[PDB]
Chains A and B, each alone.
With several copies, the nearest count.
Chain A
Amino acid sequence: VLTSIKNVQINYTKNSGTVLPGYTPSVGFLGTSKPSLGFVFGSQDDVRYEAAKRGWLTTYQDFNQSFTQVSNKLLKVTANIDLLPDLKVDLSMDRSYSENTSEQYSVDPSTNEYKPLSPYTYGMFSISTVMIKTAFSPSDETQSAAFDDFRSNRLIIANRLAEGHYGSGVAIPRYGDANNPIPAETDPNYAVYTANQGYPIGYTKSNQAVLLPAFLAAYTGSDASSSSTNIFRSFPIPNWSIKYNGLMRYKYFKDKFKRFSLQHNYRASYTINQFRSNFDYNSSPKVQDVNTNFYNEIIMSNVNLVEQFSPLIRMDFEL
Chain B
Amino acid sequence: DEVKDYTAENEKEIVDYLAQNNLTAQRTNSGLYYIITKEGSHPTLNSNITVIYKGYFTNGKVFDESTEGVSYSLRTLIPGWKEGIPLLKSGGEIQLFVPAHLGYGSNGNKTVPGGAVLIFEITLVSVN
- Measured CB to CB, the residues of A under 8 A from B are 160, 163-170, 173, 187, 189, 281-290, 292, 297
| In contact, B3 and A164 (Cβ under 8 angstroms) | yes
Query: Could you list 23 examples of A-B contacts with CB < 8 Å?
Result: A165-B107, A166-B105, A167-B5, A167-B6, A168-B5, A169-B8, A169-B101, A169-B106, A170-B101, A281-B109, A283-B63, A283-B64, A283-B109, A285-B53, A285-B55, A285-B64, A285-B78, A286-B77, A287-B78, A287-B104, A289-B76, A292-B76, A297-B109
| In contact, B7 and A286 (Cβ under 8 angstroms) | no
| In contact, A164 and B64 (Cβ under 8 angstroms) | no
| In contact, B107 and A164 (Cβ under 8 angstroms) | yes
Residue of A nearest to B62 (CB): A283
The 10 A-B residue pairs with the shortest CB-CB distance in the complex, in nearest-first order: A167-B106, A169-B7, A165-B105, A169-B5, A288-B76, A285-B77, A167-B4, A283-B64, A167-B5, A286-B76
B49 CB → nearest A CB, Å: 11
The interface residues of chain A lying within 8 Å CB-to-CB of B6 are 167, 169
B54 CB → nearest A CB, Å: 11
> What are the interface flags for B52-92 relative to A under an 8 Å C-beta threshold, 1 for contact and 0 otherwise?
01010000000110000000100111110100000000000
The B contact surface, by secondary structure, is loop
| In contact, A287 and B1 (Cβ under 8 angstroms) | no
B111 CB → nearest A CB, Å: 6
How many inter-chain contacts with C-beta < 8 Å in the A-B complex?
A: 74
Answer yes or no: B37 CB below 8 A from chain A CBs.
no
Residue of A nearest to B77 (CB): A285
Answer yes or no: B18 CB below 8 A from chain A CBs.
no
| In contact, A287 and B106 (Cβ under 8 angstroms) | no
Residue of B nearest to A280 (CB): B76
Answer yes or no: B128 CB below 8 A from chain A CBs.
no
The A contact surface, by secondary structure, is loop
B39 CB → nearest A CB, Å: 21
The interface residues of chain B lying within 8 Å CB-to-CB of A285 are 53, 55, 64, 72, 77-78, 81, 120
A189 CB → nearest B CB, Å: 8
Residue in A163, A169, A284 whose Cβ sees the most chain B Cβ within 10 Å: A169
| A164-B106, A283-B111 as given contacts; A187 in contact with B101, CB under 8 Å | no
Answer yes or no: B46 CB below 8 A from chain A CBs.
yes
B68 CB → nearest A CB, Å: 14
Contact of B75 (CB < 8 Å), options: A167, A169, A173, A288: A288
Answer yes or no: B112 CB below 8 A from chain A CBs.
yes
The interface residues of chain A lying within 8 Å CB-to-CB of B72 are 285-286
Answer yes or no: B14 CB below 8 A from chain A CBs.
no
| In contact, A287 and B5 (Cβ under 8 angstroms) | no
The interface residues of chain A lying within 8 Å CB-to-CB of B30 are 170
Answer yes or no: B119 CB below 8 A from chain A CBs.
no
The interface residues of chain B lying within 8 Å CB-to-CB of A282 are 109
B102 CB → nearest A CB, Å: 9
| In contact, B77 and A168 (Cβ under 8 angstroms) | no
Residue of A nearest to B102 (CB): A170
| A170-B7, A283-B109, A285-B81 as given contacts; A164 in contact with B101, CB under 8 Å | no
Residue of A nearest to B30 (CB): A170
A294 CB → nearest B CB, Å: 9
Residue of B nearest to A288 (CB): B76
